[PDB]
C-alpha cells in the first residue's frame, strides 16, 4: 500500500494582520505589514464556533514566548458571525468572518498601526504515511502528531511532539455545519486542527 | 496527452522594499524589512516599458484595500532605463532598473525608513493543464485565468477569477525587444503578466 492514509480534518486560525502606514502630503505608503496565523483555543472552537458559529474579534495566543493579544480594528471584543468564503474552483468548504483589511485613518506626517483579525475555518484533506506518526494538511502544513493519538484504548502510546496541554479530546461531539463523534483537537503554534 | 500546455509569457512587477534601520552609537541594525511585489499598470506596460523601455520610479498599487504609493529613494517620479539582469545559467531573459538597495543616511539614536522600488520584467514559461482554466508561471505563481481568455470570437466564455478591470487585450501589439500580435494583459495582486 503506497497510498497515504487520507482522512478529513478541519482547520481553525485567525489571520492577524497589523500594517504600518505612512501618510505623506499627497500619498500613502505601507511602511511594513506583519501577517501571522493565530490559532483558535479549544474554548472558542467548542463554545463559540461549534456551539454558535461565531469567532471572537480578538486573537490571544503565544508567539515567540509572549502572550500577544490582537484586536480587530482596535475595537472591543465582539462575536463575529462566520460566513462562507468566495467561490473557488476545486476547493473545499471554507468560512471567514472578515473580508476587508483594516488600516488606520489618514493623519499627515505620522505613522499609524492598524490591526486586522479575520477568523478563518476550513475543511482540509489530511494525509499520512507509514508509520503514521504525523500527518500533513491540504495547506502544506505539517502536524507532528499521529492521527490516531488519543486518551482512549491505548491511543496514548502513539507518537506526539506537542505538550499535553496542546491536545484535547472530546467525546460525543456533535459537529455544527456552518450523530455523536469522537473529536480530537490540537493547538499548533500557527493553527488549530480538528479531526 | 499528459504534457501541460506550454506557452511563453512576460511578467512585470516592481520589488518594493522599505527597510527600517536603527543607528546606534557604533553600529547599524535592521529593525525590519518589508518586501512586496507591486504590479505594473497597463498604462506603464504599454506607454513606458513597451513604448520606450523605461519604468516609473514609483509603485502605485492596491494592497490590503489601500492605495499605497512607494517612491524609489523617496525621490520624485523619474523614468528609469531598463537594463539586462546579471547572467545566470539556465535562466530566461530578464531586465531590471535598479541594482543597489537603498537605506536611509546614518543619524544617531534614530529609526529611519528607506524605500526601494526596482522595476523588474522577465520572460517566463507558462504552463497549463486540462481544462486549461488557469496557468502557472516559471516563478511558481498561479494565474487563475484561462490562457485563451479574451474578448474576441467567444473567448469571453473562458474561466476567469479576476474583475473585468483587471484584464486588458490589445490588438496589433508590436512587442519591443528590450509583426503584429494580439497581446493579453492581466494585473494580478502581486504582478502583471502579458502573453
Amino acid at each position: 500500500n503506497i497510498a497515504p492514509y487520507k482522512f478529513k480534518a478541519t482547520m481553525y486560525y485567525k489571520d492577524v494582520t497589523v500594517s504600518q502606514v505612512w501618510f505623506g502630503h499627497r500619498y500613502s505608503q505601507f511602511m511594513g505589514i506583519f501577517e501571522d496565523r493565530a490559532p483558535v483555543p479549544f474554548e472558542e472552537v467548542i463554545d463559540k464556533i461549534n456551539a454558535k458559529g461565531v469567532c471572537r474579534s480578538t486573537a490571544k495566543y503565544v508567539r515567540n514566548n509572549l502572550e500577544t493579544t490582537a484586536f480587530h480594528r482596535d475595537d472591543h471584543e465582539t462575536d463575529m458571525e462566520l460566513k462562507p468564503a468566495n467561490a473557488a474552483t476545486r476547493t473545499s468548504r471554507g468560512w471567514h468572518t472578515t473580508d476587508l483589511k483594516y488600516n488606520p485613518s489618514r493623519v499627515e506626517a505620522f505613522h499609524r498601526y492598524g490591526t486586522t483579525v479575520n477568523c478563518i475555518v476550513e475543511e482540509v484533506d489530511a494525509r499520512s504515511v507509514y508509520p503514521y506518526d504525523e500527518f500533513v494538511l491540504a495547506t502544506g502544513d505539517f502536524v507532528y502528531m499521529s492521527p490516531f493519538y488519543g486518551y482512549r484504548e491505548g491511543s496514548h502510546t502513539e507518537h506526539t511532539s506537542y505538550a499535553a496541554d496542546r491536545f484535547k479530546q472530546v467525546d460525543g461531539f456533535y459537529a455544527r455545519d456552518l450523530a455523536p463523534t469522537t473529536r480530537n483537537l490540537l493547538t499548533t503554534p500557527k493553527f488549530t486542527v480538528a479531526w | 496527452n499528459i504534457a501541460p500546455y506550454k506557452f511563453k509569457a512576460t511578467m512585470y512587477y516592481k520589488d518594493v522594499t522599505v527597510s527600517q534601520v536603527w543607528f546606534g552609537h557604533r553600529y547599524s541594525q535592521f529593525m525590519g524589512i518589508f518586501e512586496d511585489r507591486a504590479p505594473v499598470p497597463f498604462e506603464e506596460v504599454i506607454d513606458k516599458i513597451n513604448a520606450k523601455g523605461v519604468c516609473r520610479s514609483t509603485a502605485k498599487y492596491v494592497r490590503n484595500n489601500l492605495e499605497t504609493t512607494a517612491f524609489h529613494r523617496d525621490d520624485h517620479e523619474t523614468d528609469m532605463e531598463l537594463k539586462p539582469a546579471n547572467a545566470a545559467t539556465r535562466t530566461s531573459r530578464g531586465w531590471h532598473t535598479t541594482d543597489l538597495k537603498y537605506n536611509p543616511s546614518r543619524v544617531e539614536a534614530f529609526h529611519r525608513y528607506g524605500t526601494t522600488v526596482n522595476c523588474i520584467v522577465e520572460e517566463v514559461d507558462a504552463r497549463s493543464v486540462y481544462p486549461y482554466d488557469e496557468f502557472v508561471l516559471a516563478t511558481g505563481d498561479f494565474v487563475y485565468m484561462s490562457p485563451f481568455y479574451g474578448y474576441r470570437e467567444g473567448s469571453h466564455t473562458e474561466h476567469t477569477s479576476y474583475a473585468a478591470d483587471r484584464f486588458k487585450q490589445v490588438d496589433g501589439f508590436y512587442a519591443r525587444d528590450l509583426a503584429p500580435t494580439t497581446r493579453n494583459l492581466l494585473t494580478t495582486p502581486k504582478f502583471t503578466v502579458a502573453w
Binding site: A85, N86, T91, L100 | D141, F142, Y144, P189
Partner: peptide
C-alpha cells in the same frame, strides 16, 4: 490552494481611504 487564500478570504478590488 495557498495562493487562493487572498481570493477566497479577502477582497482584492475594494479600496478604503479617508
Amino acid at each position: 490552494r495557498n495562493q487562493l487564500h487572498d481570493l477566497r478570504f479577502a477582497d482584492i478590488d475594494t479600496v478604503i481611504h479617508a
